[PDB]
Amino acid sequence: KGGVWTNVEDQILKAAVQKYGTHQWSKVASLLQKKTARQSELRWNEYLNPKLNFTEFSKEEDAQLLDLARELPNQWRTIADMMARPAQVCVERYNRLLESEDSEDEEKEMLAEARARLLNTQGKKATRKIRERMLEESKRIAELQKRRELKQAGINVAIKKPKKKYGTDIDYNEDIVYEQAPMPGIYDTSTEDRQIKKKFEQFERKVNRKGL
Amino acid sequence: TSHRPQLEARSGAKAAAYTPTGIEHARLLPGHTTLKYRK
Amino acid sequence: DEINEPPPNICEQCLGDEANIRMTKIPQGSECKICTLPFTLYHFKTSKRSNNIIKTLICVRCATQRNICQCCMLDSRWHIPIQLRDHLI
Amino acid sequence: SAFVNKIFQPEVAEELIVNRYEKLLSQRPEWHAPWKLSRVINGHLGWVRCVAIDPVDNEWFITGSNDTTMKVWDLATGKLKTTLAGHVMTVRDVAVSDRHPYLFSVSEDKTVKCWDLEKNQIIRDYYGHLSGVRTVSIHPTLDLIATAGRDSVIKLWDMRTRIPVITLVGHKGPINQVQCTPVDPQVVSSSTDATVRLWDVVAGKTMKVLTHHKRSVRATALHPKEFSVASACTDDIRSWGLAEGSLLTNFESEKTGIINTLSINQDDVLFAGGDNGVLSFYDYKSGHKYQSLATREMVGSLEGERSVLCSTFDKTGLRLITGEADKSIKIWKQDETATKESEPGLAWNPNLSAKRF
Amino acid sequence: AILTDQIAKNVKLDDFIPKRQSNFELSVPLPTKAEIQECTARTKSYIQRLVNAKLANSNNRASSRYVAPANLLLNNSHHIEVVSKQMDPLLPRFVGKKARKVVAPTENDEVVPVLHMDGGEADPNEW
Amino acid sequence: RGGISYDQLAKLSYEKTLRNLATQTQNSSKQDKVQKDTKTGKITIADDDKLVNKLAVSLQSESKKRYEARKRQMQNAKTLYGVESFINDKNKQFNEKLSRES
Amino acid sequence: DILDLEELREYQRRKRTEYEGYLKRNRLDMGQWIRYAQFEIEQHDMRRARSIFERALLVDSSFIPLWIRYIDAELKVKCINHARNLMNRAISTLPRVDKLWYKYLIVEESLNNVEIVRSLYTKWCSLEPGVNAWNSFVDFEIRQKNWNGVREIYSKYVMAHPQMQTWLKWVRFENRHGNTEFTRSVYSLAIDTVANLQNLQIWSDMEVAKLVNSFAHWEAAQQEYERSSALYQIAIEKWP
Amino acid sequence: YIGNLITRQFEGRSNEIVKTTTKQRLDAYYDLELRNSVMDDILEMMPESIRQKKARTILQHLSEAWRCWKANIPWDVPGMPAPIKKIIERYIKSKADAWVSAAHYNRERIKRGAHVEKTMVKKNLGRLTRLWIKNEQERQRQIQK
Amino acid sequence: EHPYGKEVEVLMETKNTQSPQTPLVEPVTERTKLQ
Ligand SMILES: [Zn+2]
Ligand SMILES: [Zn+2]
């Protein structure tokens, strides 16, 4: 049951740590069927971390390794931090350096599930808020065309206001909301108020006829 | 979202224009009604 | 300021012809007709043997901002309604 | 003479950039003796946020702290008298009354608590702050307290009836320091909207607004004589003249950054505790730095912890008590056997480039 | 120079400049003893009138323990006697009093100039 | 190098509007008061109807140019980079911010 | 799209209920204030559209783009006297911000009201603001050809900024114009001022060398070598 | 009791209700203080012209750094303006002292067995197993030095 | 090891010297009582 790592599952885990972070391992194993959050954590901290050191052995490294393994006998997690390398590679070379003295059918559905889960970031509250917002506008679009179809018959039915949730709920449409008038200045805005009012009454006359 | 840090604290300016209630609290009962003055 | 409050603005024809009028003060009487916020309800009678209590319906701030009395809400000068005043000006 | 007024005919003859500079060269600052460290007191389990001295006499000072307690220290010997519990969160201001034996203490647990200093127990307590309070200033001759905190409103408490009598509403941010004066303007407040307000508690509104600071006016301190306050934003300390709101003088506060605390001696030694650990002594009359000093942090502690958080002088004026963020109290002592010679301090050298004056 | 005053009247140069820079020995006096008492007696009478307003309006009967008939209405025609109604001690006092919330307008007649100084400013890209 | 402070950039944009205003006066050349009230303290300035229109049209046109310059910059910003994996536009936007920090 | 006024009247209610809801929970976020203030301009109701900016100024009056946008909102609808009162409040609240001073200018430049910018400049240079202001003010009078007026500016400008690059800026002004009688009079005033205000120690050794050299190389171009030689001996004896 | 009830019936209840601190909201209010003090000391050391946008970023550096202290990760931000690193190290040492003192204080209270919550026993197991491994990780490092 | 100029004394205080019921201000008695 202890399975081997395919390169498909290898790419899910790298995309998982790229989004979730290196500490949320049960988040990672949810995408990754058949594998454990312990096993997911173990491979990223032993194989898949790009900070890790999988390369050739300079003779300084080989002299340093045979020094450390002589001075710290069999402390491979200790030596691998001194060598800044993964540990079983450090054992593998020490095994090899002493030998010098010689005498898609399913996986894609997992990947299609993982591709959709990584690209969906909201949760219950945002998705429900989206759904209620779409359904509220759909109710609004329906109610407006009702009034238009009744206006096709010539019978006029006004739009209903939204109901007050609480006692002092404000009809913002009804009045200037919290009218902070500008401070009284000296430069005599008398002709300018007449021209806005003439322009604003002109704008309301155009909306009744041509409709914006 | 729904779980936010504060951009500002609740100011006392808004609570000053409200009308009071006059509810009677247990810790605002009269107690230590006499000041002691230093010599 | 709850301890420093203006005297009420009431008309002459609201008070009538008699010299001394006994007025009752209630410190938070009714709420304003206009601003829906409480005030000092004054109420009084023209004569002693009258049968109609004349109350102050609006607060002093709403009576100041319109320059009307609190009782009959006519303008303090000219004694005309507000709608006719703003049409004459 | 200064030919300038003969050739460059002005309209005021004071408002030139040179005329002011000529006068300022002419006067000399009063010489003040330098200060040195006397005694280092440890003991708190957190930072020290506020220190107040006993008004009547000088035996003790109380050191409100960040381990929520208040410890009482003997001024003379340096020993520890007792400890005052009773705040769940850290103590932001402590003020002892001269007229009566009450220690008002305040915290950011939204509590203003009186203490009977005959009994060492909590008395009354005060209620009404929306958020954690930062200041207590005891009014002299009226039995009031001015408290303010993050609410942006100053709550004027009655002492006897526990009623928040007047509430002052002018500010746009958390209020950092509040001082009580005995005449109009009775309350001097400083908040993080870079304003200092001079209040009129009978009208309940501001007499004078002081917008001269660039940033959060973090500390003020009253001068025990001469009827003036000094206010400090992050890099400029300005002495304000009350009953006019006039700007008396601009100190050479440049290059200091976040001045946490201010204290004023009777001798016009002004103190400016730095968040960098650099503590600077200014002559109050001239606004001149005459000493700059840096503390040691501790045996082992962080390099950011070297910072002064709160300060006061004693009643005599020859001791400076600074509670610092290294979890310690330092007692600064004005160095005797120092004549004008031997230690003039820093040289009286202004520059017109920094246009402070 | 047709409108010399009417630009930014509330700000002057004199507000920027210090006053101790002309003489370091300028005397700002401490308030006199005759002046602190006129301010204490006015303030203590105003605060005590506020504490008595808070206690007399509370519904606790144990609050009177710790504590005008004349204003010419119009002019010269009516002298008004103002009395208090003996209220029913069971019906609630302050009938128009409720716990309602109000937002307050800010009355601003004058602009306070924000009197900073200076235009260094060089930015080392750091910060 | 550095950024430009808001005093200098205020001056430079002041000069740019002066140069553009001068070229408008040059192009207008090639193609060819104050009363204060007695009753109130209010002041009245006689203006031509032109140059008020010209200022309003210029401010609108400058707003149009900056709007379309940023809009075309929006178009380039979402068409250039495609190396790193993202989820939405805001991911690439924020990861362009981490590339600017490097 | 909106067909009649009643559909518009419902359209305005739903947006205003939306924006005021986010502004109630966030008194801050000036970008939200402007976008709702920009919305009321699109509805052509300027009385409302002034009010959201006025309410936004009561939150943060130190936010400069809020000032510039509301100034521009009054300009785009041709309300110039509403903008003049507003710009007056912008500079009287925040005198230090240069942008609010330059914003009042280019509008009055665009109206060709040259007496009003001159009255602005006189007030704005009375507050001692900095070298960017006077340089834009001497560049204004060059545009207006008022050579007597600009000479008066440098008279004050050296007395706001006493330093050689303000004195030598006034000599590059005069030597641009070749008026020899005025130029040495500027030169005489510059070197006497360094001499009589010697004790103040406000011009450095490198700073006074530029005045003496730029005096002397000017006189060599005026073919009077004996005055250019004689001032060197006076300057080295006055400053050894 | 009934005087409060009927005046609540006839007038509604007060809009101005302010919550005093208790045991449940102690650490929550300790956060709101700790956010505001770091807001002030960093907004005072900025150059000039930004208030709302850096507050998001710089306090997330604190929250990340407080997590890194709790996790014994050294918290190296690569290009960090060193006065701000002095600030965030200063307040996290301040929060460390409150966090460690409450851990010692509640552990003596549990051993006495005098009215500790059921939750607070598990919270104190969490804090002491953080501190035991920190003492372990420190002891490993100074042995290797 | 000498944490300051060595003129400065360093003192580490862990316990309260005087009892908590020590008054910390003398209560003012104007008349002597023998009750
Ligand atoms: Zn009313
Ligand atoms: Zn009437």
XYZ file of C-alpha atoms in Angstrom, chain A residues 18-19 118-121 184-190, chain F residues 37 40-45 84-88 91:
26
model
C 2.996 27.061 -4.200
C -0.496 28.042 -3.045
C -6.452 25.356 -6.893
C -8.298 27.871 -9.094
C -11.279 28.347 -6.745
C -10.377 30.592 -3.852
C -19.765 80.392 2.145
C -17.140 81.936 -0.063
C -16.589 85.420 -1.402
C -16.470 84.992 -5.181
C -20.299 85.195 -5.617
C -21.587 81.999 -7.209
C -24.900 83.556 -8.293
C -20.403 94.475 -3.898
C -22.440 92.193 0.652
C -18.769 91.464 0.877
C -19.139 89.232 -2.178
C -16.832 89.886 -5.121
C -17.623 89.648 -8.843
C -15.130 89.006 -11.656
C 4.278 32.140 -13.581
C 1.100 30.223 -12.811
C -1.734 32.404 -11.512
C -5.422 32.162 -10.681
C -6.863 35.503 -11.752
C -2.650 37.160 -8.932
